Amino acid sequence: PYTIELIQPEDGEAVIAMLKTFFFKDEPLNTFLDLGECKELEKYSLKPLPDNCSYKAVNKKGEIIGVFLNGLMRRPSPDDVPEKAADSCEHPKFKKILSLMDHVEEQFNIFDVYPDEELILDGKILSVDTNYRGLGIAGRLTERAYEYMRENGINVYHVLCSSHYSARVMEKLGFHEVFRMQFADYKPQGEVVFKPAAPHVGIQVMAKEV
Ligand SMILES: CC(C)(COP(=O)(O)OP(=O)(O)OC[C@H]1O[C@@H](n2cnc3c(N)ncnc32)[C@H](O)[C@@H]1OP(=O)(O)O)[C@@H](O)C(=O)NCCC(=O)NCCS
Ligand SMILES: CC(=O)NCCc1c[nH]c2ccccc12
Ligand SMILES: CC(=O)NCCc1c[nH]c2ccccc12
C-alpha cells in the first residue's frame, strides 16, 4: 500500500537520499560511468521541485519508494540563447551525461514537434525503489502529472529515456518515441562515449499528448 503525493520543499533531503540509494547507482548511464558522489546531480535533481509538479510514492511507513521529478519547459523566445548544460558542470562523469543531453537538444527540439505549444511538461528524473519495482508505481507517478497538466492546460509530456528498457515502460503508459539515438552512434569527438549492455541500445525521447 502506497500513496502518490506532491513533493514539498521540506522533502528535498529525503528525495536526494532516495536518489543516492537508487537512481545515482542504477540508472544505466550512471552505473556505466560509476557516477559516485555527485553533488551537481543533487543540485540538478532539486531544481525542478519548486515548479510544484514533482511526485513521490510513499509506503505505509512514510518512506519515499519512488519519485518522478518534473519541470515546466517553455518554448525558447525568438531571441533565445541556447545554453549548454555541460558548460556549468565540474563533475567529469556527470558532464558526460549533460553533454549527451546537450547533443540531443542540438539534434532535436521538442518544440518543433508541437509548434502551437508554449509550455510542455518535462519528466526529468524517474526512480523507483528496487523492492517496489514491477508494481506499476512508475505509471501511477506518471499519471499523477496528467492531473497537473489538465489543471493547467498543458498538452504535452516529454520524457528523455536513457534506455530502451525505460522507453518501453513509457510506451506501456501511452507515450510514443519522438527521437532516438543509438549509443553506438553518439561520437561527439569521433569516438563512442557510452558502451552499456546491448539491450539498452540508446536514448529515446518519448512524448504523450494528454
Ligand atoms: C524504470 C523504472 C522507474 C520503472 O519503475 P517501475 O515502477 O518498476 O515500473 P513498472 O512497474 O511498469 O515495471 C516495468 C517493468 O519492469 C519489469 N519488472 C517486473 N518486476 C520487476 C522487478 N521486481 N524489478 C525490476 N523490474 C521488474 C517488467 O518488465 C515491468 O513491465 P511489466 O510489468 O509491464 O511487465 C525502474 O526500473 C527504475 O527505477 N530504473 C532505474 C532508473 C532508471 O533507469 N529510470 C528511468 C530513466 S528514463
Ligand atoms: C526520466 C529520467 O529519469 N530520465 C533519465 C535521464 C538521466 C539519465 N542519467 C542521468 C543522470 C543525471 C541526470 C539525469 C539522467
Ligand atoms: C524506432 C525503433 O525501432 N526504436 C526502438 C529500437 C531502437 C532503434 N534505434 C534506437 C536508438 C536508441 C534507442 C532505441 C533504438
Map out the domains of the chain as residue ranges: 1-210
CATH number for 1-210: choose from 3.40.50.2000, 3.30.70.20, 3.40.630.30, 3.20.20.70.
3.40.630.30
Resolution in Å, one decimal, please: 1.4
Q: C-alpha angle with apex 112: 109 to 113, nearest 5 degrees?
A: 105
Nearest to 18 by CA among 135, 145, 126, 144: 126
Interval between CA 138 and ligand 1 midpoint (Å): 7
Q: Is 41 in the pocket of ligand 2 (CB under 6 A)?
A: yes
Ligand 2 centre distance from Cα of residue 125 (Å): 5
Question: In a mutational test of the pocket of ligand 2, which residue from 29, 94, 102, 157 has the highest number of ligand atoms less than 8 Å from its CB?
Answer: 29
C-alpha grid cell, residue 156 = 504535452
Q: What is the DSSP letter of 163?
A: S
To the question of whether residue 49 is assigned a binding role by annotation, the answer is: no
Query: Closest by alpha carbon to 97, among 191, 188, 190?
Result: 188
HSE at residue 48, side-chain half, CA atoms within 13 A, is 23
The technique by which this structure was obtained is X-ray
CA pair distance 52, 109, nearest whole angstrom: 24
Which of 4, 133, 143, 177 to mutate to test ligand 1, by most ligand atoms within 8 A of the CB atom? 133
Sheet holding 55-59, edge to edge: 2-6, 55-59, 64-74, 119-128, 156-161, 202-209, 176-182
CB neighbour class for 59 (10 Å; exposed up to 12, middle 13-18, buried from 19): middle
Q: In this structure, is the dihedral angle defined by the CA atoms of residues 62, 147, 7 and 100, taken in order, positive or negative?
A: positive
| Helix or strand run (H / E) with residue 69 | strand 64-74
Report the C-alpha gap between 19 and 32 in whole angstroms: 16
Rounded to the nearest 5°, which phi and psi values hold at 195? -130, 60
